[PDB]
Amino acid sequence: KCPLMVKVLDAVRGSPAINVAVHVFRKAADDTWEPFASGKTSESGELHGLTTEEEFVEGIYKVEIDTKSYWKALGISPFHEHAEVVFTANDSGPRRYTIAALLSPYSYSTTAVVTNP
Amino acid sequence: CPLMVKVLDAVRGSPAINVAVHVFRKAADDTWEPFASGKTSESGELHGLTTEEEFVEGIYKVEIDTKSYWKALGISPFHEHAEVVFTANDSGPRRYTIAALLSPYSYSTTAVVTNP
Amino acid sequence: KCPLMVKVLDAVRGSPAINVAVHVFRKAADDTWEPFASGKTSESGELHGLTTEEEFVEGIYKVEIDTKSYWKALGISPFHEHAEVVFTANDSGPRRYTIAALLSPYSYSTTAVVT
Amino acid sequence: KCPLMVKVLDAVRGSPAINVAVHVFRKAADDTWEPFASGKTSESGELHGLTTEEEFVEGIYKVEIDTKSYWKALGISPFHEHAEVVFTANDSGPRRYTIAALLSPYSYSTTAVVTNP
């Protein structure tokens, strides 16, 4: 599918995160983040087709996950406003990037698995 | 303080209070011989479970009663307990501390070793 | 889809762990673990077909991951001898259990997804 | 004691992360991050005396951890550029905030524990 993938899981429910707001930002020469892409996590807990391979380029991107929206809907008070993931992309070749995050009311753990297709 | 166990709660965002801690030791018969047991304090860390002279090289298993603690808080957990097995003092005496961040249906364990 | 699946990731390299020994046990009335199944992690790092729904029944199952063997092969000495995931299966009814274990030399994180 | 404390640990070595850059920001009226305080992680891996009780305010704050700089000294190529923790401070009243971060080359986990004085 798309080179960029996002998966989110909630510890409290033990079920994949559904209806999650994720925003992708792209670096600019003015040191400002531009709204590269936005999407909503599916009921399966993953987001596919976020960015086309050709559109995806060599840049520093920022990925933000809206922690409050999921926790406010569930009714649990969240400590973090959002989870922010920033990294460089395509240092050498058009390698695919998968972003995985684990959510909790007062903590979160994120990991990225990198594959070369 | 040869061995320390620090336990933290994710949902409450506060250190876990009175989590059952069980420490075992390996035997020649491939059976665990109970070493020590305790309950966590208010700060969440239980200390003094072992003494350096008594603390000896071997394969030790540390059990944390996650089910007993979290069920008391009133929601059903997934893991029956957490087992942290590890050889102790492979090369000389060292200070071992175990950190376990608890959550329903998921947990993470991290250990910090200190040579002196 | 297999009733039980195990996904193992190596945060150190950032790529899924390959050739990881995964052992499954069963609780007995004598408080003794009986080997249920064993396998080796594939290239994708996920194990499928390790158990069948017919054999898979309610009980207390322990999943072992040979972290010490894997990290020794890569040349890194790990703190934990292995990872044990003890849980109760089908307490209420038939459910699909997925085990996710993120590995590290001196730490690990276990996460379960229920379908 | 200290209203804001930060503890950082490395999963690769199982030791406190020494000489790690920590940066604290505060929200302004124009939605611009204004630097508040910054320090280097000590040998024990914890920061003490970063915010004063009077100076610490009820605004929004951000804590940034320079994971990439730490890995460069070790010599391991990291995935993430840095780790950022964004949270509302003093929603109700004075509080003691402790931020704990576990670092890995391609993943990290952050947890927050609060003490009521």
Swiss-Prot record, chain B:
<feature type="binding site">
    <location>
        <position position="6"/>
    </location>
    <ligand>
        <name>L-thyroxine</name>
    </ligand>
</feature>
<feature type="modified residue" description="4-carboxyglutamate; in a patient with Moyamoya disease">
    <location>
        <position position="33"/>
    </location>
</feature>
<dbReference type="GO" id="GO:0042802">
    <property type="term" value="F:identical protein binding"/>
</dbReference>
<keyword id="KW-0034">Amyloid</keyword>
<dbReference type="GO" id="GO:0005615">
    <property type="term" value="C:extracellular space"/>
</dbReference>
<keyword id="KW-0622">Neuropathy</keyword>
<keyword id="KW-0765">Sulfation</keyword>
<feature type="glycosylation site" description="N-linked (GlcNAc...) asparagine">
    <location>
        <position position="89"/>
    </location>
</feature>
<keyword id="KW-0795">Thyroid hormone</keyword>
<keyword id="KW-0325">Glycoprotein</keyword>
<dbReference type="GO" id="GO:0007603">
    <property type="term" value="P:phototransduction, visible light"/>
</dbReference>
<dbReference type="GO" id="GO:0005179">
    <property type="term" value="F:hormone activity"/>
</dbReference>
<dbReference type="GO" id="GO:0032991">
    <property type="term" value="C:protein-containing complex"/>
</dbReference>
<dbReference type="GO" id="GO:0042562">
    <property type="term" value="F:hormone binding"/>
</dbReference>
<keyword id="KW-0732">Signal</keyword>
<dbReference type="GO" id="GO:0003105">
    <property type="term" value="P:negative regulation of glomerular filtration"/>
</dbReference>
<dbReference type="GO" id="GO:0005576">
    <property type="term" value="C:extracellular region"/>
</dbReference>
<comment type="subunit">
    <text>Homotetramer. Dimer of dimers. In the homotetramer, subunits assemble around a central channel that can accommodate two ligand molecules. Interacts with RBP4.</text>
</comment>
<comment type="similarity">
    <text>Belongs to the transthyretin family.</text>
</comment>
<dbReference type="GO" id="GO:0001523">
    <property type="term" value="P:retinoid metabolic process"/>
</dbReference>
<dbReference type="GO" id="GO:0070062">
    <property type="term" value="C:extracellular exosome"/>
</dbReference>
<keyword id="KW-1008">Amyloidosis</keyword>
Swiss-Prot record, chain C:
<dbReference type="GO" id="GO:0032991">
    <property type="term" value="C:protein-containing complex"/>
</dbReference>
<dbReference type="GO" id="GO:0006144">
    <property type="term" value="P:purine nucleobase metabolic process"/>
</dbReference>
<feature type="binding site">
    <location>
        <position position="7"/>
    </location>
    <ligand>
        <name>L-thyroxine</name>
    </ligand>
</feature>
<dbReference type="GO" id="GO:0001523">
    <property type="term" value="P:retinoid metabolic process"/>
</dbReference>
<keyword id="KW-0765">Sulfation</keyword>
<dbReference type="GO" id="GO:0044877">
    <property type="term" value="F:protein-containing complex binding"/>
</dbReference>
<keyword id="KW-0963">Cytoplasm</keyword>
<keyword id="KW-0372">Hormone</keyword>
<feature type="binding site">
    <location>
        <position position="109"/>
    </location>
    <ligand>
        <name>L-thyroxine</name>
    </ligand>
</feature>
<dbReference type="GO" id="GO:0003105">
    <property type="term" value="P:negative regulation of glomerular filtration"/>
</dbReference>
<dbReference type="GO" id="GO:0042802">
    <property type="term" value="F:identical protein binding"/>
</dbReference>
<keyword id="KW-0597">Phosphoprotein</keyword>
<dbReference type="GO" id="GO:0140313">
    <property type="term" value="F:molecular sequestering activity"/>
</dbReference>
<keyword id="KW-0225">Disease variant</keyword>
<protein>
    <recommendedName>
        <fullName>Transthyretin</fullName>
    </recommendedName>
</protein>
<feature type="modified residue" description="4-carboxyglutamate; in a patient with Moyamoya disease">
    <location>
        <position position="34"/>
    </location>
</feature>
<feature type="binding site">
    <location>
        <position position="46"/>
    </location>
    <ligand>
        <name>L-thyroxine</name>
    </ligand>
</feature>
<dbReference type="GO" id="GO:0042562">
    <property type="term" value="F:hormone binding"/>
</dbReference>
<keyword id="KW-0964">Secreted</keyword>
<comment type="subunit">
    <text>Homotetramer. Dimer of dimers. In the homotetramer, subunits assemble around a central channel that can accommodate two ligand molecules. Interacts with RBP4.</text>
</comment>
<dbReference type="GO" id="GO:0035578">
    <property type="term" value="C:azurophil granule lumen"/>
</dbReference>
<feature type="modified residue" description="Phosphoserine">
    <location>
        <position position="44"/>
    </location>
</feature>
